[PDB]
Design a protein around this ligand. Sequence first.
Ligand SMILES: [Zn+2]
Ligand SMILES: [Zn+2]
Lengths: 111, 361, 88, 176, 46, 49
Amino acid sequence: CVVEENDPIFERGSTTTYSSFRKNYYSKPWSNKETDMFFLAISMVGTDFSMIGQLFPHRARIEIKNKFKREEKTNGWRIDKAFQEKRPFDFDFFAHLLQKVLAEEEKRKQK
Amino acid sequence: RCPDCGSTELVEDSHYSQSQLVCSDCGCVVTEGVLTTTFSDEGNLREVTYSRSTGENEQVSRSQQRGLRRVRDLCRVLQLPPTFEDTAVAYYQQAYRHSGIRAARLQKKEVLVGCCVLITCRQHNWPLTMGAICTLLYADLDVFSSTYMQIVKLLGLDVPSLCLAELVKTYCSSFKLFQASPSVPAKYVEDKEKMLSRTMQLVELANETWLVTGRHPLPVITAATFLAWQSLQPADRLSCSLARFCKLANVDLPYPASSRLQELLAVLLRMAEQLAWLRVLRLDKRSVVKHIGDLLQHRQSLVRSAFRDLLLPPCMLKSPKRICPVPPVSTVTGDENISDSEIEQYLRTPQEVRDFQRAQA
Amino acid sequence: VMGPMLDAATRKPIWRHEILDADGICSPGEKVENKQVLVNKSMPTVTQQPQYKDVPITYKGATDSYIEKVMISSNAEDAFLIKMLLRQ
Amino acid sequence: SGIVPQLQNIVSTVNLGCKLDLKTIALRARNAEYNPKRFAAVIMRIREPRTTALIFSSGKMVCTGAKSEEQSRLAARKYARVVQKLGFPAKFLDFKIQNMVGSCDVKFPIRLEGLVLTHQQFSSYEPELFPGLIYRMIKPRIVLLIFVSGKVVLTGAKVRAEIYEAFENIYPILKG
Amino acid sequence: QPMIYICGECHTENEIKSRDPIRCRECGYRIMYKKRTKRLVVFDAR
Amino acid sequence: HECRLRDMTYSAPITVDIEYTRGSQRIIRNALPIGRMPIMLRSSNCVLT
Ligand SMILES: [Zn+2]
Ligand SMILES: [Zn+2]
C-alpha cells in the first residue's frame, strides 16, 4: 500500500475533445557557431550520418538528417563549397571544438 | 387477362372483406380468395434470414466478432439510434471482405471501426469530429488518419462534407455558460439561443470569407463563439481573453484558435471601415467586438466591399513579386560522359577507409 | 411517398386517390370513404436500381370519416412519423 | 490554358543485369550510406543533378529527384558507371519512366467544396485530415493535390505530355 | 409548386421542400402540421 | 405532450461522477451519462410541476 505518494488528477471530461492529430517532435534549435561546426564536421567526414551522429552528443541522428536536408534544399551552394574543400579527419580536435562551443553557449547563457 | 374476351383490363377491388380479381369488361372473375398468415401463427413461427440459411453468420472468427462488438459498444456509448448501429455493422461486414483488411493488427481493426462509425454518422448528416471518436479508441490519431485514407482509397464510399451549421449546433451546446452553476459567476451566463444564432452568423461570415477551407473547423467555431459571448455583454467580458473563456467553459482551446480569432477580428475591422459611423469611431482589434451586431446585420454588402478591394495565408501575402521562378533549362547530357574526376572525389581512400573502420571498430 | 395518381383520361387523380394532396398525403378537412388511400407510401424492394413497391395506407372503415388534422415529424432515426386524426 | 506545368521529380527504374555486394560499394564510396539494421539497401547521393538513388543487391536500381527524362537517364548512366568503377559488370538495360511529379499554379482561388460536389466520384476531399483536396481523374490515372491557394500538384504520369494534358483538362474544371 | 405547412406554436406559414429538416422559421420548433384543404366540402345538417 | 406526439419516452439523462486509475493514475469524471431514467409526470423533475 502506498502512503500518499500520488496526487489526484482530473483528466478528460468524457466530453467532446479536440482532434489534435499532431505529434510535435521536439527538435533542439541550431546555433550559428553550432551550424558552422556542423558544416566543418560535414566537410571533414563527408555525408556519413552515423559518424556525425556519433560525434554530436548535443544533437540526434534525425536532427542532423533534417538539418542536412534543409541545407541541401536551401544552401546547396554552401554544401558544395564545403564538399570541395578538404581537411584532415579530426575526431579529437572535433571534441575539443565541441567543448569550446559548449563553453561559448554557457557564457552566452550567463550574459 | 380475360379468358373469353381476352381483355387485359383486370383490376383489383375490395369486396366485403374478400380479395378477388374481376374483369371490368365482362364482369367475370378470374381469381378469387387469398391466403394470409394469422397473428396466432405469425407469433409462433420464426423468421429466417438468407445468411443463416446459406450457412453464413457462422464464419465469424473471434477477431470479426470482437470488431463488431466494438462497433456495437462504440455506437451505443454515443447514444445513437439503432439504424446507425445497423449501418455501421453493415459497413464493417462490407469492409471485412478484403484479404488485406482482415489480416491486420488490433490497431488497424480499431481504427477501421472508428472510420466505419464516422462514415455511418456522416451519411445521416450527423457531425462528429475524429477527435471525439479517437477519444474512445485505444489508439493514436496519426495512424487513424492514415488507415482512414487507405480504406477510403480502397472502398471509395460516399463521404459527405462536414456541415458547419450542425457542427456549431453540436459544439456550442457543450459549453456550460448557459447555466448559472456555482463554478461560473452569474455575469458570464448567456442565453443559449442568442449565442447559437450569433455564432452561426459569425461562422457564416467566416465561411464566405474563406475561413473554413484548409483550417480545422473547431478553432474557427471556438473563436466565433468567444466573439459572440463577448459581444453579448462587452462591459464585463471585453477584459477577459480566449484562454479565460475556455477555462471558464471547461473546454480545451484549440492551439490555432488564436490565429483564427485574430484573422476574424481583422476581417471585422476591415468590414467596419466601410460603415460611416464605425469608420469615424476608429475602432481597434479590441473595441470592435462590441459592434459585431451592426456588422452582422449588414454583413453581405460589407464583405462584398471588402472583397472588392479575397483571403490567403499571411505567408504568401508578403507581396511576392517572383511567383514560381522558372528554372534554367539544362536538360543536356554531355556527349556520353561529362567527367571522371567526380568518381575520384566520391571514392574513399585507403586512409579514409582505415579511419572509418577505426572510428566504429 | 408518391403524389396522387393522376388519371391520363381525366387529367385528375383517380377515385381511390381523390383525397390525396399534391405531396401524396391526405389533406385535413376532406371526407374519406372505405378503401381509399391516406398515404401513398412506397417501399424499396431491395432493403441495384431503385425498385419501389406500393404499400398505400388505406382507410379500412365501416362508414365515411373526416380528417381534422395531419401532423408530420421526424425522430433522430430520420424516420418520418405521419399521423392523421379521423373524425366521425 | 496559357500555363505550362513545371516537372519537379522524375521516377525511372533500370536493371543492371548482375548481382552486387552492397557492403563493397558502401565501403569504397563517400556519398553512399548503408544501414542494414533498418534498411537493407545502399543510399547514394549525386550532387550535380541534385538527385538521390537506391541500390539493391538484386541488381535493381531507381533514381529520384530528376526533372526531365534526359536528366534521369544521365543520372542512371552516372550510377551505372560508378558501380562499374567499383568492379561490377553493370549494364544500362530496361530503362523506362515509371512516374513523374510536377507542380504548377492557377493564380486564383479554388472552392474545394464545389469541385467535390460536382466531381464527387473523381475526388475525395477531407479537410479534417489534410488541407489539400485530392482529385483522382481516372482517364489518365492522375492524382492531383489541390489547395485553396490555387497551386496544384500532379503525379502518376509516364510522359510530360500526360501531365500537360491532365493540367489542360483540369484547368476548365477549376475555372468553373 | 410551393408545398406549404404550418408549424407547431407560432403558426408560421412554412413552405418547405422535401427532405428538409423540420424547423420553424423565427423559431426552432420541430413539430409541424399541414394546412387545410382548399377544395370545397359539402356537409349535411343532419 | 411533444413526447406523446412523436412516440418517444419522456425521460431524463442519468449523470454520475466517477474516479478510476487507467494507468495507476487517478482520473475523475464530473458528469458522465450512464442511461436515461423515465420521468413520471408531475414529479419533482417533470417540467409540469
Ligand atoms: Zn369477359
Ligand atoms: Zn413556430
